[PDB]
Amino acid sequence: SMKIDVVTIFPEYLQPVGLVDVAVHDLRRWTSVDDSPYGGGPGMVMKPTVWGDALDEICTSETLLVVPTPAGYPFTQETAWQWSTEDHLVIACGRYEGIDQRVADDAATRMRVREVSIGDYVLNGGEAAALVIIEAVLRLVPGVSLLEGPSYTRPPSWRGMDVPPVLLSGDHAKIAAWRAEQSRQRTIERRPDLLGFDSP
Amino acid sequence: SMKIDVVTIFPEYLQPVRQSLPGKAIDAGLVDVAVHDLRRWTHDVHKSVDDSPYGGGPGMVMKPTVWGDALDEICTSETLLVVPTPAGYPFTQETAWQWSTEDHLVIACGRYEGIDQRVADDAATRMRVREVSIGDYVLNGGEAAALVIIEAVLRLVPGVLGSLLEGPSYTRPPSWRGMDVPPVLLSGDHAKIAAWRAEQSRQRTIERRPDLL
Numbered sequence: 391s392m393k394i395d396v397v398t399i400f401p402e403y404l405q406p407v408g409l410v411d412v413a414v415h416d417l418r419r420w421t422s423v424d425d426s427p428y429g430g431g432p433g434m435v436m437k438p439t440v441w442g443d444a445l446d447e448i449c450t451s452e453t454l455l456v457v458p459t460p461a462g463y464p465f466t467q468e469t470a471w472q473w474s475t476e477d478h479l480v481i482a483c484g485r486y487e488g489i490d491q492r493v494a495d496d497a498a499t500r501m502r503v504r505e506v507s508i509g510d511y512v513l514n515g516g517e518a519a520a521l522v523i524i525e526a527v528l529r530l531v532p533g534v535s536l537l538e539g540p541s542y543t544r545p546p547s548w549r550g551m552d553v554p555p556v557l558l559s560g561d562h563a564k565i566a567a568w569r570a571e572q573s574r575q576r577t578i579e580r581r582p583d584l585l586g587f588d589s590p
Numbered sequence: 591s592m593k594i595d596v597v598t599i600f601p602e603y604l605q606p607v608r609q610s611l612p613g614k615a616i617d618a619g620l621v622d623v624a625v626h627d628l629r630r631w632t633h634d635v636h637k638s639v640d641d642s643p644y645g646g647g648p649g650m651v652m653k654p655t656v657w658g659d660a661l662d663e664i665c666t667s668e669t670l671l672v673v674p675t676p677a678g679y680p681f682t683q684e685t686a687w688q689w690s691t692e693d694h695l696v697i698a699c700g701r702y703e704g705i706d707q708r709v710a711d712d713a714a715t716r717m718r719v720r721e722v723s724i725g726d727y728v729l730n731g732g733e734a735a736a737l738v739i740i741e742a743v744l745r746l747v748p749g750v751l752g753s754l755l756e757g758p759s760y761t762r763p764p765s766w767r768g769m770d771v772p773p774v775l776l777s778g779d780h781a782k783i784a785a786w787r788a789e790q791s792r793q794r795t796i797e798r799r800p801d802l803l
């Protein structure tokens with residue numbers, strides 16, 4: 391059984407959401423949420439004050455506080471497995487140029503905190519990352535290596551393109567070996583790092 | 591000026607995109623995002639989009655005939671066809687930059703175990719096709735990946751959405767819950783501030799992303 395709370399200034403974005411409940415909270419309920427960065431630089435930083443009040447009410451010492459950020463530890467399938475057995479996830483979604491670092495630092499004095507990134511690209515805020523994290527985690531909740539090769543279904547010939555004949559053969563050993571070969575070839579081509587080789 | 595067409599059996603999932611788009615960008619004709627229900631192109635009264643995998647195994651595979659008809663209608667020779675898949679090439683910021691100048695992206699969102707491979711292979715004989723993954727985790731389908739791709743791409747298109755890791759950021763108040771903003775940031779010594787930030791970036795990168803080194 392898992393509870394997930396998502397905190398955002400754009401609750402409208404989270405709309406795409408009995409063993410798990412997901413609740414979305416408008417951060418503005420606890421209040422200008424942003425100001426210029428100390429030290430200078432472009433854009434705005436979310437003030438810690440409003441976040442502190444929201445998280446005070448929502449979190450407990452048992453909470454795993456998840457903070458999407460481009461500067462986070464990588465969120466991976468291993469992370470998804472790890473979080474799948476948590477009782478309570480709180481996902482703090484930033485906007486602007488991010489959240490004052492003291493929010494995570496203050497939270498870590500009371501609960502476990504995880505700053506994570508879902509990939510090496512830049513988003514406008516944490517909401518899309520929250521949707522990715524929720525989806526990856528929820529499909530693993532109790533009671534719910536190499537790249538996959540290609541898949542095929544009927545008809546066996548389509549637009550003059552045939553399903554690989556081995557897949558029609560009924561020979562499990564040959565099919566397994568072919569699928570292994572397809573996966574090896576794909577992994578080498580697209581993700582050689584997974585097999586311990588240099589990236590392109 | 592970019593057109594994005596998304597094809598999915600869950601068009602409601604792409605609602606956040608339409609909500610993120612500023613009216614000024616749309617009325618300026620800078621961007622148009624359209625979402626299409628794949629079932630519009632099904633052949634049967636049961637609106638079937640999936641079937642059992644050749645060679646056996648768990649799960650289902652999306653039908654090539656349905657997808658073929660959908661992409662035939664939506665794509666042209668100039669389309670960049672984007673196919674999210676956990677077996678894809680990595681989608682990165684470089685990818686987002688490259689795609690930000692495209693006239694027409696079509697994002698084909700799969701579900702189940704994915705789409706019959708002949709769909710992409712056939713499309714690739716007459717348009718540019720890109721199978722990509724947004725990260726090293728498994729999703730239920732391509733919709734969340736489409737949201738990520740659309741956001742990362744469109745934020746790079748001028749006026750549409752409104753190395754090393756970045757170190758910590760701070761703003762008002764100068765003291766909060768016993769924690770002071772690092773005094774160097776209030777020093778007015780901007781060369782020193784830059785050096786402090788560089789070191790913070792170096793430390794965070796070593797700790798969180800040693801692969802980047």
Ligand SMILES: N#Cc1c(-c2ccc3ccn(Cc4cccnc4O)c3c2)n[nH]c1N
Pocket residue numbers: 457458459460462483484485486487488489506507508509510511512513514515516517519756
């Ligand atoms: N997880 C994940 C992320 C994010 C992501 C997450 C949360 C926020 C909150 C604000 N922004 C924009 C932003 C933050 C910091 C610096 N510059 C910016 O433009 C975010 C980006 N971007 N890319 C990922 N993989």
Ligand SMILES: N#Cc1c(-c2ccc3ccn(Cc4cccnc4O)c3c2)n[nH]c1N
Pocket residue numbers: 538674675676678699700701702703704705722723724725726727728729730731732733735
């Ligand atoms: N981009 C990206 C993705 C996806 C992703 C994309 C598209 C589809 C279509 C079906 N599924 C589910 C699925 C595919 C293969 C095997 N098992 C499954 O459960 C997808 C997953 N998962 N993880 C990423 N980084």
